[PDB]
Amino acid sequence: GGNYNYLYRLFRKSNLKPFERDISTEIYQAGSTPCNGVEGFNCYFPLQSYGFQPTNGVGYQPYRVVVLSFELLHAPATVCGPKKSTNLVKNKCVNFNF
Amino acid sequence: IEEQAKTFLDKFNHEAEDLFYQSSLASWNYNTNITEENVQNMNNAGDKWSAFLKEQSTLAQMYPLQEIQNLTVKLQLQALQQNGSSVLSEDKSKRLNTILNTMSTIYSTGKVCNPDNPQECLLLEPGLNEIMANSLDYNERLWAWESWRSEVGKQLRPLYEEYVVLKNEMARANHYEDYGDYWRGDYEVNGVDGYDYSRGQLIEDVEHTFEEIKPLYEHLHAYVRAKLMNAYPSYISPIGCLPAHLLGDMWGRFWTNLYSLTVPFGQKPNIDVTDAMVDQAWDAQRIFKEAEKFFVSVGLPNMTQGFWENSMLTDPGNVQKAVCHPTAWDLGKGDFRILMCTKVTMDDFLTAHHEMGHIQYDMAYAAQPFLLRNGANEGFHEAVGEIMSLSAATPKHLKSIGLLSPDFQEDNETEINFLLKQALTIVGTLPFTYMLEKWRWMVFKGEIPKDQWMKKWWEMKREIVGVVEPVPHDETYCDPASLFHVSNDYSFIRYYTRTLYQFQFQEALCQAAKHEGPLHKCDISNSTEAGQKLFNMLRLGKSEPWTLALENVVGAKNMNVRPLLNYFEPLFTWLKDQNKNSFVGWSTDWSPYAD
Numbered sequence A: 001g002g003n004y005n006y007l008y009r010l011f012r013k014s015n016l017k018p019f020e021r022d023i024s025t026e027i028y029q030a031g032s033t034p035c036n037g038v039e040g041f042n043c044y045f046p047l048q049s050y051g052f053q054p055t056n057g058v059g060y061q062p063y064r065v066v067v068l069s070f071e072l073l074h075a076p077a078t079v080c081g082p083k084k085s086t087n088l089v090k091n092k093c094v095n096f097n098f
Numbered sequence B: 001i002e003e004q005a006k007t008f009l010d011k012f013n014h015e016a017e018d019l020f021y022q023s024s025l026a027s028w029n030y031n032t033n034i035t036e037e038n039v040q041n042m043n044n045a046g047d048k049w050s051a052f053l054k055e056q057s058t059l060a061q062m063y064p065l066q067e068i069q070n071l072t073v074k075l076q077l078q079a080l081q082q083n084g085s086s087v088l089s090e091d092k093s094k095r096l097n098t099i100l101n102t103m104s105t106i107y108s109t110g111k112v113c114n115p116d117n118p119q120e121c122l123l124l125e126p127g128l129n130e131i132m133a134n135s136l137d138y139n140e141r142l143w144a145w146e147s148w149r150s151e152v153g154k155q156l157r158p159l160y161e162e163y164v165v166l167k168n169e170m171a172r173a174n175h176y177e178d179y180g181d182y183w184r185g186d187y188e189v190n191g192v193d194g195y196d197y198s199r200g201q202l203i204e205d206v207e208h209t210f211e212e213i214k215p216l217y218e219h220l221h222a223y224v225r226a227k228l229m230n231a232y233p234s235y236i237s238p239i240g241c242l243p244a245h246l247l248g249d250m251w252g253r254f255w256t257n258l259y260s261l262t263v264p265f266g267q268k269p270n271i272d273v274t275d276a277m278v279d280q281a282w283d284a285q286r287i288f289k290e291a292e293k294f295f296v297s298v299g300l301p302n303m304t305q306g307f308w309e310n311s312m313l314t315d316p317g318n319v320q321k322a323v324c325h326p327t328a329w330d331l332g333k334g335d336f337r338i339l340m341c342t343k344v345t346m347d348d349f350l351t352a353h354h355e356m357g358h359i360q361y362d363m364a365y366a367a368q369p370f371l372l373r374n375g376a377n378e379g380f381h382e383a384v385g386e387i388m389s390l391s392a393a394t395p396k397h398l399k400s401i402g403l404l405s406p407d408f409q410e411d412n413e414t415e416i417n418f419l420l421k422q423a424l425t426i427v428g429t430l431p432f433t434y435m436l437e438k439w440r441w442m443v444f445k446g447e448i449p450k451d452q453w454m455k456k457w458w459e460m461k462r463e464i465v466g467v468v469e470p471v472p473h474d475e476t477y478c479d480p481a482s483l484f485h486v487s488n489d490y491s492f493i494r495y496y497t498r499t500l501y502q503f504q505f506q507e508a509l510c511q512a513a514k515h516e517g518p519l520h521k522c523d524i525s526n527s528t529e530a531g532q533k534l535f536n537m538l539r540l541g542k543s544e545p546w547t548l549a550l551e552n553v554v555g556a557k558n559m560n561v562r563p564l565l566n567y568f569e570p571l572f573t574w575l576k577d578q579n580k581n582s583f584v585g586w587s588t589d590w591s592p593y594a595d
């Protein structure tokens, strides 16, 4: 029946900066004539919706997308991956890291 | 301005797709499971599409069209701006729709009952179809011929005549001359500096090409006229034309019905690998496995894996009311579907490819914009599919898949048979397809007055096609009107050119695939370079004018019949031995009644 609860913005005057976020819903005007806040010719609401039905081909099915990006600003001690640790031994000349 | 339109189409090409997606979905679920509520469920959903289309069709008259520079977005608007109707008076608008379905139903209610028994009253498809197909009686088939058009086309003559009238005034209001000018409009390409194409020039192209094959059509007509005196003595003169009621069907479009009485060597067993399939337990999955296995061997991608479950391959085991006709569904969003009822023969092995080729053709231009997702013209969609069925008719293909014995020896006695099966299909329709569309336009452009519409129709059947009437017809039968695409308002030139485009695709690949024998023995399988040149054309769709698209494979800018006459040369070598005593030619004065 169409899961129309996922939307996307197709209109802007200018392209974004990197990492920029625009949750505004201001009614877009493409043409010269103003609109007095309603829609009309060359005068469009700048959000549209994803049509999703489960019998759609790949490339048209929703994907759950996770974007990372690391940062190193000025922080002393932060997080990081996991550091494994081998088994400790005793009574033998060994090369160790604690 | 130009920059206001290029944003408007980004509104149209998202809000139309998800309303197109459901409107084809209801016509899918109804056609696989017929109920009453699903008739209603597709009426409003299809009405959501028609009202939305006439909603934005009027918006393209806000923008003037010739101030745009990008030809891509210029092509989208000129299709969308097309009104079609809506330019006339509205009591006159319903007047054609009062004509139109009334023209549609009279063709579908044509009942025929005998003078000896008016109680058994046959329709066209039950019985009446089988009379002209297999029954071999002369006095029978003349009764079925005359009583069909005198009882169906007699009645559409006061329907079609006024329907020509109101079709042209709408057409001239879109600045044309007739409705014949409108149908040429899919071939018209203007202003791209060397690939340009005007509407009137296709009349010149069809009049040049058709005169070149007229030796061959005179030679099949000579050969079959040497054969019909056996099955029909004392009825056809060997100099004159053929009567119009024994031609294979009611109008004789296809001549496939006449292979049996006109076989070259009746004692020679034609290949029909049907018993071979059942001795290896060939189910429905085994057929479409090889059909996909052939297309990966040529250099084209797999099936989309949502093709298999979502399609209906067979008829269902339940008593399921569903229309059974092999079609390829192209609903969108990466969903492509097939629908047929497979019975495991070699015949359904042949049409297993012609429908799969439509999928891979619609799998090709999936990256196009929405208004350009067709073939490059209307003849290209059935042309790309049927050349894939030609590759399965080669016996080297079947023995390579493990279906023929390896010691199968291709004698030339079955080659004279096998090419004669094709020649009663391929060459059998082209003097039919041209002779109608030549007639329909002079009626459309008004070169014939209405008291002469039948008078000039039954002339050109005799000279071009070599067929004489059984019965003299006055102005009251509408003998052209009785045909399906005639009575259902369909453009009939798309069937002539579709044949010519096939072989231009065919031999150019068989030149690329390094074949050395005759044209009917080349094989496209196992090659890559025959797939690469073809894939170059398939990804275009309508983003390019077709005149550039045709030279992408062959290298020319118009239809060339020289590939077609390359095919029949083993046949035509054999056939010229068969007219050493017969008379290649028809006299158009003799009739079966004027004696």
Ligand SMILES: *[C@@H]1O[C@H](CO)[C@@H](O[C@@H]2O[C@H](CO)[C@@H](O)[C@H](O)[C@H]2NC(C)=O)[C@H](O)[C@H]1NC(C)=O
Binding pocket: B033, B034, B035, B038, B320
């Ligand atoms: C053909 O389609 C109709 C409706 O599309 C089916 O009828 C009902 O469909 C709903 C689907 O939401 C089911 O929940 C009901 O159980 C169906 N009714 C019955 C009596 O089963 C119908 O079933 C379909 N035909 C077949 C053979 O399944």
Ligand SMILES: *[C@@H]1O[C@H](CO)[C@@H](O[C@@H]2O[C@H](CO)[C@@H](O)[C@H](O)[C@H]2NC(C)=O)[C@H](O)[C@H]1NC(C)=O
Binding pocket: B006, B070, B072, B073
């Ligand atoms: C106007 O035509 C140009 C090409 O003549 C199109 O330009 C392409 O645009 C796409 C994305 O918009 C790019 O990925 C291509 O690299 C561009 N090609 C070239 C050669 O520049 C342009 O898209 C057309 N305008 C519209 C609105 O479709």
Ligand SMILES: *[C@@H]1O[C@H](CO)[C@@H](O[C@@H]2O[C@H](CO)[C@@H](O)[C@H](O)[C@H]2NC(C)=O)[C@H](O)[C@H]1NC(C)=O
Binding pocket: B061, B081, B082, B083, B086, B087, B173, B174
């Ligand atoms: C579609 O039909 C209209 C007729 O209603 C054609 O003409 C337009 O007519 C209205 C008023 O009747 C004018 O305001 C428009 O300016 C007219 N259009 C133009 C382009 O001048 C219209 O031309 C038709 N469109 C096509 C593509 O044939």
Ligand SMILES: *[C@@H]1O[C@H](CO)[C@@H](O[C@@H]2O[C@H](CO)[C@@H](O)[C@H](O)[C@H]2NC(C)=O)[C@H](O)[C@H]1NC(C)=O
Binding pocket: B412, B413, B416, B574
């Ligand atoms: C199939 O090929 C054979 C071999 O060439 C043909 O047989 C010859 O036909 C010519 C033509 O009349 C005769 O003069 C020869 O005497 C034939 N030779 C033999 C060994 O039979 C045969 O005609 C071909 N069949 C067809 C239908 O083309």
Ligand SMILES: *[C@@H]1O[C@H](CO)[C@@H](O[C@@H]2O[C@H](CO)[C@@H](O)[C@H](O)[C@H]2NC(C)=O)[C@H](O)[C@H]1NC(C)=O
Binding pocket: B297, B400, B525, B526
């Ligand atoms: C054409 O493609 C077929 C399919 O791969 C090839 O057929 C192989 O033929 C050899 C010898 O007859 C068999 O041993 C193989 O098992 C066949 N392949 C398969 C997958 O069964 C054939 O070789 C190809 N043509 C050429 C010239 O390579």
Ligand SMILES: *[C@@H]1O[C@H](CO)[C@@H](O)[C@H](O)[C@H]1NC(C)=O
Binding pocket: B296, B301, B302
């Ligand atoms: C098609 O599917 C087969 C499954 O046997 C797979 O091996 C093959 O790689 C696929 N084709 C392509 C071009 O990836």
